[PDB]
Amino acid sequence: HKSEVAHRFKDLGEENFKALVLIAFAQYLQQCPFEDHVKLVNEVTEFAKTCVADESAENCDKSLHTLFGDKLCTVATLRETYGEMADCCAKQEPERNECFLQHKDDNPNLPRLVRPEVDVMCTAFHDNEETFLKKYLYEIARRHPYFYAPELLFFAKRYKAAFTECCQAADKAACLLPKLDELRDEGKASSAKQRLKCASLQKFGERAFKAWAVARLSQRFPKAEFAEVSKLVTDLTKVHTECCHGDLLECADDRADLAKYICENQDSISSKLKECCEKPLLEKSHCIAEVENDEMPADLPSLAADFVESKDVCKNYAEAKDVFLGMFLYEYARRHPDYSVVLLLRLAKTYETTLEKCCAAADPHECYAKVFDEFKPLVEEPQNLIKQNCELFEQLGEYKFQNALLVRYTKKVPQVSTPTLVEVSRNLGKVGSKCCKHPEAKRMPCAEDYLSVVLNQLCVLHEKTPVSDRVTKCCTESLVNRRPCFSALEVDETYVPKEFNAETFTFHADICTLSEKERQIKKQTALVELVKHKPKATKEQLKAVMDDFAAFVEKCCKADDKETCFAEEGKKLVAASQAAL
Ligand SMILES: COc1ccc2c(c1)c(CC(=O)O)c(C)n2C(=O)c1ccc(Cl)cc1
Ligand SMILES: CCCCCCCCCCCCCCCC(=O)O
Ligand SMILES: CCCCCCCCCCCCCCCC(=O)O
Ligand SMILES: CCCCCCCCCCCCCCCC(=O)O
């Protein structure tokens, strides 16, 4: 790297370079229009080419940070539009780049991106593919200034793939709409995960992160020796620590350094990394992060020997407590790919707590002899919740499963906004659809990754406008206790029924023409208000009010005249429902 631009241009290729530069500027100049970004990208790209042709050509030896910051400072409208950020340009480069980092705005007032009609989108794509995808790349990037740029590039390539398939085909919308909802979903979850993982780093600390990573890595690479795992985790901590501070280039080099080290030590790590390690720089680290679990060594010993039975458990423990507990976690985790990480950390903390107690006592050995018994209830709690909830999901499917979740949660925390209860019960229900399709042995993992994001979403909303000390309690709990605290929420005995409000339970003919989704949401919103108003209501009384509403809606949308029915029979539902509750 006599010239860092030329080297990156050569490593990326022109198309990836141009996209990544568009995303990087999009995340810093969130208010400047597309055409101004197209102009920055073309200028940085002309410049890069000059350096590829001649590494000694003028300005080519400058740092990428330097070049990025100088282009920002050439934006003539910078002060008028972004203000404080323009004062970063008066700084000398080390402190300058630090100043730009603080002056991104997480979440700007930008209007929601409306999904155009399938036919408008498909024609847009066909006429000018590059500006269709790029404009929307710009639009996403500016709305998510913290999303890892190469992952956003990963999503774009999948969108593009979706249009290329679905737009020359028989029924475009029935192909394209399912692809786009899943991309939408998966993109929203990716953004929330990145956010979560940096918040968790700050809240819960470096130790907690290392434990998490030791557990996840040991499941992934069970053939790796513990020293290799601790080496990966120590470099991962650095990397994630740097990525959370937010400097794209430094994050990308750190991730590239890890991926390079991992790829150069495959045989010492995992037999599943061949295909990731053959990919170009840009995708390597992404592929490695997603790689499948290696198969565990076939005849591994019991953990009682090193952690229960040997003399010097206490000696080994006292000498390096975190190293010992790390080893316990490594050995437990590599044996249990079927466990959630968080369950593996519960188990580790149960072992820590017992060592702490037992190594003091005169006979530690008798004291901690039954620690493995303490793991039993810990393992079975999540396994049964998952049993019960998938069995329920199978009987009364996704939509009806949602309505079950919606009654449950509304009674536990009636103080929570109706939209919030609907959305999180909708989301929980989707995690049902997905994870109950896995066999038991794969389910707890599936549960964890998605529930982690549903629960953090839940807590951030609730921190913005609190409402329940109990939701606040669980939201502030240790990361291992979050979900069990929510699971220990009982029906709220304090709560005073919300008062009657007839508009809430008035429905018009508008509902039989609404989309499937919109009719479902409208019905769920009424369900919650019903429960809020009648939280004393038993199972059978709700089902009787629900089957009646369902018969009422078919009556009024099968009829020769609808609007009279959606008002006549609405009196003959609401009045009977109150009396029966
Ligand atoms: C192959 O090189 C890498 C590079 C970076 C990685 C990983 C692997 C893995 C995982 C793996 O190796 O399976 C993670 C998780 N990486 C992150 O940057 C990251 C993102 C969010 C958080 Cl909270 C923490 C770290
Ligand atoms: C290479 C070893 C690194 C060790 C990293 C920390 C190991 C701690 C294991 C105890 C359980 C940790 C669970 C997080 C919550 C907590 O206990 O504070
Ligand atoms: C004139 C300024 C140019 C701006 C450069 C834009 C940022 C390009 C760097 C991103 C490359 C990603 C490298 C992959 C690393 C990884 O995640 O494995
Ligand atoms: C604004 C705060 C939002 C809270 C909305 C309530 C949603 C239900 C929260 C409790 C359940 C979380 C999942 C725990 C698993 C279980 O059901 O046992």
Inside any domain, residue 298: no
Listed residue (5, 10, 37) closest to 24, CA to CA: 37
Residue with tokens 């790029």: 134
Instruction: Tell me the Ramachandran region of residue 561: left when phi exceeds 0, alpha when psi lies from -120 to 50, beta otherwise.
Output: left
Give how far Cα 288 sits from Cα of 11, 221, 332, Å: 18, 11, 22
Residue with the smallest CA separation from ligand 4 atom 16 is: 487
HSE-CB for 269 with a 13 A CA cutoff:
24
CB atoms within 10 A of CB 2: 10
Residue with tokens 């008798």: 366
Does residue 105 have a known ligand-binding role?
A: no
Inside any domain, residue 112: no
Q: Pseudo-torsion of CA 244, 247, 249, 255, nearest 10°?
A: -10
CB atoms within 10 A of CB 315: 12
Listed residue (472, 548, 535, 525) closest to 499, CA to CA: 535
The C-alpha atoms of residue 378 and residue 508 are separated, in whole angstroms, by 49
Atom of ligand 4 lying closest to residue 409 CA: 8
Inside any domain, residue 496: no
The set of residues, in sequence order, having a beta carbon less than 8 Å from that of 176 and lying 6+ positions away, is 118, 121, 122, 162, 163, 166, 167
The C-alpha atoms of residue 125 and residue 163 are separated, in whole angstroms, by 7
Within 6 A (CB) of ligand 3 lie 8, 20-21, 24, 44, 64, 67-68, 71, 150, 248-249, 252, 255-256, 259, 281-282, 284-285
Ligand 1 centroid to residue 197 C-alpha, Å: 11
Query: Which long-range contacts link 526-529 to residues 24+ away (Cβ below 8 Å)?
Result: 527/403, 527/406, 527/407, 527/410, 528/406, 528/410, 528/418, 528/421, 528/422, 529/418, 529/498, 529/501, 529/504, 529/505
**Beta carbon of 420 within 6 Å of any ligand 4 atom:** yes
Inside any domain, residue 85: yes
The set of residues, in sequence order, having a beta carbon less than 8 Å from that of 448 and lying 6+ positions away, is 340, 341, 342
Query: Do 278 and 318 sit in the same domain of this protein?
Result: no
The C-alpha atoms of residue 496 and residue 261 are separated, in whole angstroms, by 60
**Residue 571 identity (one-letter amino acid):** K
Query: Do 332 and 360 sit in the same domain of this protein?
Result: yes
The C-alpha atoms of residue 572 and residue 569 are separated, in whole angstroms, by 5
The C-alpha atoms of residue 30 and residue 20 are separated, in whole angstroms, by 15
Give how far Cα 551 sits from Cα of 88, 398, 430, 509, Å: 65, 20, 26, 14
Query: Do 404 and 467 sit in the same domain of this protein?
Result: yes
Listed residue (493, 568, 5) closest to 249, CA to CA: 5
**Substitution candidate for ligand 4 out of 409, 410, 443 with most atoms within 8 A of CB:** 409
Structure tokens at 148: 């890892």
Query: Do 342 and 387 sit in the same domain of this protein?
Result: no
Resolution of the entry in angstroms: 2.1
Using DSSP, state whether 323 is helix, strand or coil.
helix
Listed residue (478, 487, 505, 480) closest to 413, CA to CA: 487
Query: Do 323 and 263 sit in the same domain of this protein?
Result: no
Query: Do 529 and 463 sit in the same domain of this protein?
Result: no
Q: Tell me which of 79, 103, 127 is where a domain ends.
A: 103
Inside any domain, residue 347: yes
Does residue 312 have a known ligand-binding role?
A: no
Q: Tell me which of 167, 185, 200 is where a domain ends.
A: 200
Using DSSP, state whether 187 is helix, strand or coil.
helix
Query: Do 387 and 377 sit in the same domain of this protein?
Result: no
Does residue 254 have a known ligand-binding role?
A: no
Query: Do 387 and 479 sit in the same domain of this protein?
Result: yes
The C-alpha atoms of residue 406 and residue 294 are separated, in whole angstroms, by 38
Q: Tell me which of 289, 315, 334 is where a domain ends.
A: 289
Inside any domain, residue 497: no
Using DSSP, state whether 536 is helix, strand or coil.
coil
Residue with tokens 């018969």: 551
Query: Do 136 and 192 sit in the same domain of this protein?
Result: yes
Phi, psi of 166 (to 5 degrees): -80, -20
Nearest ligand by distance to the CA of 282: 3
Query: Do 9 and 80 sit in the same domain of this protein?
Result: yes
Ligand 4 centroid to residue 406 C-alpha, Å: 10
Angle at CA 72, nearest 5°, toward 69 and 75? 150
Residue with tokens 């080390």: 94
CB atoms within 10 A of CB 302: 12
Instruction: Say which CATH number the domain at 535 has.
Output: 1.10.246.10
Structure tokens at 259: 């991926």
Q: Which domain holds residue 79?
A: 4-103
Q: What technique was this entry resolved by?
A: X-ray
Using DSSP, state whether 413 is helix, strand or coil.
coil
Inside any domain, residue 494: no
Query: Do 249 and 226 sit in the same domain of this protein?
Result: yes
Q: Which residues of 454-463 are buried (b: 16+ CB within 10 A; e: fewer)?
A: bbbbbbebbe
Number of domains in the chain: 6
Phi, psi of 563 (to 5 degrees): -65, -30
3-state secondary structure 249-295: HHHHHHHHHHHHHHHHCCCCCCCCCHHHHCCCHHHHHHHHHHCCCCC
Phi, psi of 337 (to 5 degrees): -60, -25
The C-alpha atoms of residue 564 and residue 406 are separated, in whole angstroms, by 30
Phi, psi of 351 (to 5 degrees): -65, -45
Query: Are 342 and 483 spatial neighbours (Cβ–Cβ below 8 Å)?
Result: yes
Inside any domain, residue 470: yes
Query: Are 224 and 268 spatial neighbours (Cβ–Cβ below 8 Å)?
Result: yes
Does residue 365 have a known ligand-binding role?
A: no
